[PDB]
Design a protein around this ligand. Structure first.
Ligand code: IHP
Lengths: 67, 335, 83, 211, 62, 150, 69
RNA sequence: ACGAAUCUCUUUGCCUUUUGGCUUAGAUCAAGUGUAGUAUCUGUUCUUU
RNA sequence: GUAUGUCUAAAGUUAUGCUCUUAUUUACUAACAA
């Protein structure tokens, strides 16, 4: 489902670059990492619960046997 | 008795669950939904068993309360067909002697047809292998093979039972009859001979489509042309009104009674051949551990069965058109 | 014959096997010491063993009496044939 | 040599087929076919259906039965399976009757030996393997005992190694009582009996030691 | 008292058993109500054929 | 407390509405039990009827029991009196073992019994409003006494 | 070898078993709160002028007819 | 002869090692060699019983 | 060729009709060669 996040980032890049490279030509030297960074933060927000559950159960199994 | 009752009940419940599940699956398959390859095979199996059960129940029904055909109806049919051939001066097909210059040629066709199954698939079953061997021997010993065939036709009226399966066209699963190779050769040769004799003798009138030696799109085109070329067909002036009637003769083969069929054939060919053919449709239909004597209903999957179907079709056609209009469509018998 | 009858009838039998030939309670502990004849209990033990032994040998004889493949099948066909 | 199946039913072969049918029943025709080196599945099943099955009959037809037959012929034209069913006979026989009315050993012994071997061998490989392992295990045990006993004779006392316990909560039952579900509490006193049985036990142990 | 169920399908233990106890049903006998109509039908055909035949010969002789 | 007064599967139980009791079924016997103390209340006259599937009691002390025979039983919950047998019908095509009432319940009214039968049928039953003590009385109750539970 | 079910895994043992303390997926709190209630040419022819069985239902036979050819 | 006990057999009663799931019968029935092993064959001779 | 399953991996628990010789088959097996 991280494909969504990845896709979003791609979209941002496409958007950003072509507002970043109006008169400027092509090349790699654009920075501006904000909105993508925002995306990743929100992905982490989404997943923090999921990983608390998942890894929770995992380490529980490591410690307590499986039910 | 109480136990027998209880178990009967519980299997009816289970059976109900099964059948309904199967039905649901087949609609699902039609829809084109996510469904397990394994699951679809399972459903095919279930539906086949269900079909067989249905079928042999129909056979039972047919037995238990007589044939669907009223004897008067049968008589009428006979009268019609008799009238037709009377009008045609149609000399019947003889039982094939040693006379023919074509005999060998005829044999070669059937063998070729049979071979067509086996040229592609290199890995072959035991039955398939046997069939191939028979074919090979037949090539080796043509006259002898012919003799054997003739003997069989004269004598053999009880055959090896016909195994079946269902090829899975995911709308409609199609039955596949598998005749035991030895009889299959006979069926082939007989079929080919019948077609050569029938077409030679002008049995089947022009109007019957599928066998015409013209391609289905070609056939369609011809039909269209015919429609156009009708004299002043498109006029709507003088209250002229055309109607085209497409319909399917439902279960046309699947309720041909052998008695009636036998007698009908005895009109068109030497009675021995008729007897043979009737006896071939009456086989035991083994499928996956369940069998039944196919007491009532033509089997499409014999080689010659097509001819029988076509001949039966002629009857229906005659019934539709009557003697006169049919006679016109055919034309005069001589030309 | 039900297990009702077969019990009483076997009861009647072992009474014929008998026909061949004190209570002290500490209520605080609840222990009801029935001091009875130690010779008679021994006579029960030997008789009961002998009864079970007689039955044990009875099967052994009937096992050694004789459309099958293995030990079990032969008997399984015998379970069908008795009907 | 590999080849296409067929031929003729030798009586021994027929008998073998019958045996197979008794064993595996009337719907596993592959297995039965396999049992016969010459004859096919289909062939076999057909044979069983047509000739070999005992719930058929080959007794001659009474005059009434003859009438019924020929009447059927008159009415059902050469639908001989149907006719057979009506008669309650197998079809070929019926047809024959109607017609009448109108007017090497080494190989065989090989398959026999193989056959009998099979029929008297009715277990999947899991079973066979298991019994094999059992007897092997037993052998191993006795060998171990022989070593231990030998050493005892020699004067070195070696305790027998435990079974390498498969899991943490795996039980040895000689350690302590399995799951001592005690008797129901005593209404009648049991103390002397407890003593006597204890003595008997200890005595038995002593006997074993001496044995 | 239920009979020991034996199958025509599946022995787990591979016990061979008698052939009568194996295969059964034994109820093909019926034959009577099935025929009521077939006689009429085949007879009808026979008579129809007769009529056609004699007719054909008659007309032929004209 | 653990009541055990049943030979067979206790496979149909029902609380009485206004009594605080519970009837239970076996293969034949249908006890009725007073669950304050954990005490028995009443044996019933179910001596020949089938295996009871369901056992819904009415508001008005009209204990129902559904037979694997197919026969709808009907009891006076207070006494045990089998005041109606009713052999059910099956749907035209069914087999004779299938007529088996596998479920049952009464409404709030108590004047409509609903029965989930194995004939894929949901049969419903009214009490006759044309009935009297002379027009359709019960089945002439008689405690049998033949080494019986009553 | 491989055998039918007779005496089910009775939740007596599962009761006396120790807790696991895992967090399954569905035991995550879903729908926390409960609801409550208020309280000439036509002459010349030859012929001129429910069941409770799933294997014998009109729907069933028809279905079979449809899905065989 | 009656009563009892012991033994053997026979008749019945008891089934006393006495079929422990489901699926599309769950599916599909082959073209092999030499080398070795293993077993099984069969002959083969002689010995003595 | 594998899943898989066993095995080993070192320290001493204090008691007084047959035997024979062969040649042939068939079967199965064989990550051995063709
Ligand atoms: O469209 P994407 O598959 O995500 O690939 C893009 C795209 O390259 P393509 O057009 O060849 O696919 C960009 O090219 P432009 O459309 O902007 O011409 C390019 O951006 P730059 O031109 O700014 O380099 C960027 O490359 P980069 O990631 O180096 O910025 C590159 O992404 P990928 O390199 O991941 O394919």
């Amino acid at each position: 489902k991280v494909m969504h996040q990845i896709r979003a980032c791609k979209d941002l890049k496409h958007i950003i670059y072509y507002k970043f490279n109006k008169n400027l030509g092509k090349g790699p030297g654009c920075g501006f990492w904000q909105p993508a960074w925002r995306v990743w933060l929100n992905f982490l927000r989404g997943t923090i619960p999921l990983l608390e559950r998942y890894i929770g159960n995992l380490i529980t199994r490591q410690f307590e046997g499986r039910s | 008795a109480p136990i027998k009752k209880i178990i009967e009940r519980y299997i009816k419940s289970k059976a109900d669950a099964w059948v309904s599940a199967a039905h649901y699956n087949r609609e699902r398959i039609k829809r084109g939904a996510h469904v397990e390859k394994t699951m679809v095979k399972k459903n095919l199996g279930r539906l086949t068993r269900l079909w067989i059960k249905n079928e042999q129940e129909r056979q039972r029904q047919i037995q238990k309360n007589g044939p669907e055909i009223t004897p008067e109806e049968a008589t009428t049919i006979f009268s019609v067909m008799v009238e037709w051939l009377e009008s045609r001066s149609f000399s019947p097909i003889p039982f094939p002697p040693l006379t023919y210059k074509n005999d060998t040629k005829i044999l070669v066709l059937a063998l070729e047809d049979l071979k067509d199954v086996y040229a592609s698939k290199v890995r072959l079953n035991a039955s398939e292998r046997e069939e191939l061997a028979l074919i090979e021997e037949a090539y080796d010993n043509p006259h002898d093979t012919l003799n054997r065939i003739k003997k069989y036709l004269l004598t053999q009226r009880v055959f090896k039972p016909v195994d079946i399966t269902m090829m899975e066209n995911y709308q409609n699963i199609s039955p596949v009859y598998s005749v035991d190779p030895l009889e299959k050769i006979t069926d082939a040769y007989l079929d080919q001979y019948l077609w050569y004799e029938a077409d030679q003798r002008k049995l089947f009138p022009n109007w019957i489509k599928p066998s015409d030696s013209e391609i289905p799109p070609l056939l369609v085109y011809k039909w269209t042309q015919g429609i156009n070329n009708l004299s002043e067909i498109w006029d709507v002036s003088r209250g002229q009104s055309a109607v085209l009637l497409e319909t399917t003769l439902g279960e046309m083969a699947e309720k041909i009674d052998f008695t009636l069929l036998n007698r009908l054939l005895r009109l068109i060919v030497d009675p021995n051949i008729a007897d043979y053919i009737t006896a071939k449709n009456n086989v035991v239909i083994n499928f996956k551990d369940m069998s039944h004597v196919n007491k009532y209903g033509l089997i499409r999957g014999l080689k010659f069965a097509s001819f029988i179907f076509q001949y039966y079709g002629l009857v229906i056609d005659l019934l539709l058109l009557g003697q006169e209009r049919a006679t016109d469509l055919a034309g005069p018998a001589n030309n | 014959i039900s297990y009702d009858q077969l019990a009483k009838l076997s009861y009647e039998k072992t009474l014929r096997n008998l026909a061949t030939q004190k209570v002290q309670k500490d209520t605080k502990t609840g222990k009801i010491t029935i001091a009875d004849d130690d010779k008679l209990v021994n006579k029960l033990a030997v008789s009961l063993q002998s009864e079970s032994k007689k039955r044990y040998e009875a099967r052994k004889r009937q096992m050694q009496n004789a459309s099958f493949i293995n030990d079990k099948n032969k008997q399984f066909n015998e379970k069908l044939s008795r009907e | 040599p590999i080849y296409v199946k067929g031929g003729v039913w030798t009586n021994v072969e027929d008998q073998i087929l019958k045996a197979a049918v008794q064993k595996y029943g009337t719907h596993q025709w592959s297995k039965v076919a396999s049992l016969l080196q010459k004859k096919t599945a289909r062939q076999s099943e057909l044979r069983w259906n047509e000739y070999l099955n005992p719930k058929l009959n080959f007794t001659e037809f009474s005059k009434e039965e003859d009438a019924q037959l020929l009447d059927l012929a008159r009415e059902l034209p050469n639908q001989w399976r149907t006719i057979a069913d009506m008669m309650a006979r197998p079809a070929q026989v019926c047809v024959e009757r109607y017609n009448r009315l109108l007017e090497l050993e080494d190989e065989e012994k090989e398959m026999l030996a193989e056959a009998r071997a099979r029929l008297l061998n009715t277990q999947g490989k899991k079973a066979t393997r298991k019994i094999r392992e059992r007897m092997l295990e037993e052998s191993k045990r006795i060998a171990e005992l022989q070593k231990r006993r030998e050493l005892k004779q020699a004067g070195i006392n070696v305790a027998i190694k435990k079974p390498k316990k498969k899991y943490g909560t795996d039980i040895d039952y000689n350690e302590d009582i399995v799951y001592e579900q005690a008797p129901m509490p005593g209404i009648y006193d049991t103390s002397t009996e407890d003593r006597q049985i204890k003595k008997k036990f200890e005595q038995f142990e002593r006997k074993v030691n001496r044995k | 008292k239920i009979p020991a169920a034996v199958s025509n399908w599946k022995n787990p233990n591979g016990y061979t058993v008698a052939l009568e106890r194996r295969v059964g049903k034994a109820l093909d006998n019926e034959n009577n109500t099935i025929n009521d109509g077939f006689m009429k039908l085949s007879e009808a055909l026979e008579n129809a054929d007769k009529k056609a035949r004699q007719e054909i010969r008659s007309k032929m002789e004209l | 407390k653990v009541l055990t007064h049943h030979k067979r599967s206790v496979r149909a139980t029902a609380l009485h509405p206004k009594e605080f009791s519970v009837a239970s079924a076996c293969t034949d016997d249908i006890r009725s039990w007073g669950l304050a103390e954990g005490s028995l209340l009443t044996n019933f006259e179910s001596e020949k009827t089938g295996i009871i599937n369901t056992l819904s009691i009415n508001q008005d002390d009209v204990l129902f029991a559904g037979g694997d025979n197919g026969v709808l039983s009907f009891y006076d919950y207070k006494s045990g009196h089998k005041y109606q047998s009713l052999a059910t019908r099956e749907m035209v095509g069914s087999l004779e073992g299938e007529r088996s009432v596998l479920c049952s319940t009464f409404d709030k009214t108590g004047l409509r019994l609903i029965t989930g039968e194995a004939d894929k049928s949901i049969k419903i039953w009214k009490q006759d409003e044309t009935a009297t003590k002379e027009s359709e009385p019960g089945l002439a109750w008689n405690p049998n006494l033949s080494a019986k539970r009553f | 070898s491989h055998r039918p079910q007779l005496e089910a895994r009775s939740g007596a043992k599962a009761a006396a078993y120790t807790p696991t303390g895992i967090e399954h997926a569905r035991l995550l709190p879903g729908h926390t709160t409960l609801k409550y209630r208020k309280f000439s040419w036509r002459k010349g022819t030859a012929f001129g002028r429910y069941i409770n069985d799933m294997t014998k239902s009109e729907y069933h036979q028809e279905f079979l007819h449809k899905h065989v050819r």
